[PDB]
Amino acid sequence: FPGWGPYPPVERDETSAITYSSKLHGSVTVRDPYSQLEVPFEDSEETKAFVHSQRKFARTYLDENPDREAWLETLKKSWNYRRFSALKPESDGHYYFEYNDGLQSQLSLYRVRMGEEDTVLTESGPGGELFFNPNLLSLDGNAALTGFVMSPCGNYWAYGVSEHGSDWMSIYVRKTSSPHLPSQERGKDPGRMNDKIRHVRFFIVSWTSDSKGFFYSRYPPEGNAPAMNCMVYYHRIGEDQESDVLVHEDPEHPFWISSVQLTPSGRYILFAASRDASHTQLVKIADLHENDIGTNMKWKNLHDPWEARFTIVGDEGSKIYFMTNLKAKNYKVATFDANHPDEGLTTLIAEDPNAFLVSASIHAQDKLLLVYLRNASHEIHIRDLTTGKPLGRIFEDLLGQFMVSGRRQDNDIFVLFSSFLSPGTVYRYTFGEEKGYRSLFRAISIPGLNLDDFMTESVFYPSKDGTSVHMFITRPKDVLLDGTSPVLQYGYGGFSLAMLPTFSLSTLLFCKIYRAIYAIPNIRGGSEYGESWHREGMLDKKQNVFDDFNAATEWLIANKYASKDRIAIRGGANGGVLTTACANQAPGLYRCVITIEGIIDMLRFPKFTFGASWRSEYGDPEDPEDFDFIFKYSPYHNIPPPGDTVMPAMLFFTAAYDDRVSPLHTFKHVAALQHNFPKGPNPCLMRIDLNSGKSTQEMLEETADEYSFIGKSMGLTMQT
Amino acid sequence: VIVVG
């Protein structure tokens, strides 16, 4: 039938099956024709053949569309705008800040002497002094800075760097007196120290107060299998990693993930273990003034394991300030007296039953700054650290999200504000006795976009079960709600992750060029309406997430925001569960489905990298009761029979290698959709990357593919 | 701070 067909051959094992315990059925035998695509790309010629053919296939179709180059050109022109973070004060008396003059692959880190900061981010360029330029590390600029910490003394700088197609990293150290030079040559990291810390999978680095070494988590030496045997080690500056002192290993629970935080004073070390993706921890305190660093430290329980999470907020001698959800699912601030360990935690800021606490931090010595969630947006609240009493709101006039910078010792914070409409304003705030000094420090501006052409509405719609759901709707002020407009509708729905007002230039360009609407339904699974909003979109209520999303699409059609024939949907990772399911359950509703790094096989996820931890969210597919509710929606196992559904056009983004979400999820589902719908009529494509990111070039190329694919699929014309 | 793509 189709001009673009047939689909590339995809090989089948007609005999591959697994038998699962079922509470309703005793057991269920599930056949997996495409189980051989669980074998990594590097380790199988079949997985290679599949990746290479599906890749060539998607490319010829994406590149046959003139609008693909159109979109690449538009995006390049427009993304060429200056981007910067808030200034970040450090122990070497410098503000450090991230900058991008426009189309550099990675952010560079610049710094400026504290007191000279009003010379930076001018028409002239970033000013200050370049400290670190990631782009210089690799020739292709895919080598990425994954995190960094300055020593207490201000003389050392520990940083993580990923290589391109890998999510592992090494930790390096360089003197703060050894910055990168603008005129260094590509493909190398000059003024670094010998220290190399390999076999790290995440950057959780804590210096001791003496600046002589740092704690880090690492794994055993090196695909696809579950991540096992996370250990905490202490490294001393100057020594080879072979010398690093073991602090923690739990050989019995190899799936657990562990790390350590020091309090600001660097006196108390908090060990936290995670056994799943829930906000619960096994959690110990040691006094570093009372202990050699090693396996023979005097640990004491902060609390019974697996009831709560604990984040250090500050310390006052033997008193430690914690942000915790201990008997507070929406989180609170409580103190712990290491000198009275039996007394447990004392509430300093009570849980708000109608607002999720996002963060707490100490500024101007005794000002507690709280970020809460209300109406799927951030509110900043100031408290007296000592009494806990309210001292008022700051930035009440801004609706969006904040990133706060400033330490307890500074009377100053730098606050990055952003929203669907504001790309980033760095404000400066100075605390006073009763009231503070706010000023606008710097504001990102985009040439070739008039932000005043756009608007964001806040609507409420009922889901299937009658739950009122909040949605943001961003669109050109001058499109008619006459039921003809296309929609790009984006979802996550899980892990207590709130969809905040977020700036995306690409998104606003999509609204302008396609006279389109950008819909963000705050579906259950998120924290937007506190922790119970997550509980009503997980495990056996996971279906509520899909229901909330369908109902959003239906509200937009009913209220004339959108053509019923021009609904595009989009989701990543856990949002890939949402897209694939909604595609299976309501293919009628959707004209285009974009799945990124998608989680799709809800029976097999626990077997791959970090998937085992997702069992707290989806349920345990090897549990007979859980199997039943998981199996009803498992997108990979719920592709509709081909006779009487027309599948929407579908495009799947994935790399060939990926630690976070194993690409076998995409591989198998694509393979299966194509096998089940061999003649289309709308194409199911897999857009592959042969280096897992991410350079700005990769990102605009993906976006060009995405938008060109949506325009084609929904028969939209680009406008000028 | 555990692991969710």
Numbering used by the authors:
A (entry chain A): 3 to 224, 230 to 700, 705 to 731
B (entry chain E): 805 to 809
According to the publication:
OphP is an essential enzyme for the biosynthesis of the macrocyclic peptide natural product omphalotin A. The enzyme has been proposed to proteolytically release a peptide intermediate from the precursor protein OphMA and to macrocyclize the multiply α-N-methylated core of this intermediate to produce omphalotin A. Our *in vitro* experiments demonstrate that OphP does not process OphMA but shows robust macrocyclase activity on pre-processed α-N-methylated peptides. OphP tolerates sequence promiscuity in the substrate but has a preference for highly α-N-methylated substrates and for N-methylated glycine residue at the catalytic site. The promiscuity of OphP is explained by structural analysis of co-complexes which reveals a predominantly hydrophobic substrate binding cleft with few interactions between substrate side chains and OphP. Similar to other POPs, the monomer has two domains, an α/β hydrolase domain (residues 1–82, 453–738) and the seven-bladed β-propeller domain (residues 83–452) ([Fig fig4]).
To characterize the interactions of OphP with its presumed natural substrate, S580A mutant crystals were soaked with a ten-fold methylated Oph-18mer^NL^ (W1-^me^V2-I3-^me^V4-^me^V5-^me^G6-^me^V7-^me^I8-^me^G9-V10-^me^I11-^me^G12-S13-^me^V14-M15-S16-T17-E18) and a seven-fold methylated Oph-15mer substrate (G1-F2-P3-W4-^me^V5-I6-^me^V7-^me^V8-^me^G9-^me^V10-^me^I11-^me^G12-V13-I14-G15) ([Fig fig2]) (both substrates yield dodecameric macrocycles with the underlined residues). The Oph-18mer^NL^ complex was obtained at 2.0 and the Oph-15mer complex at 2.5 Å resolution. The two complexes overlay with an RMSD of 0.9 Å over 719 residues. Rather the peptide bond of ^me^V8 is closest to this residue ([Fig fig4]). The peptide adopts a different conformation in the active site and as a result, the side chains in this complex make different interactions than the 18mer^NL^ ([Fig fig4]**)**. This complex demonstrates the plasticity of peptide recognition by OphP – rather than disclosing additional mechanistic insights – and perhaps explains its rather broad substrate specificity, as there don’t seem to be clearly specific interactions with the substrate except for the P1 pocket residue.
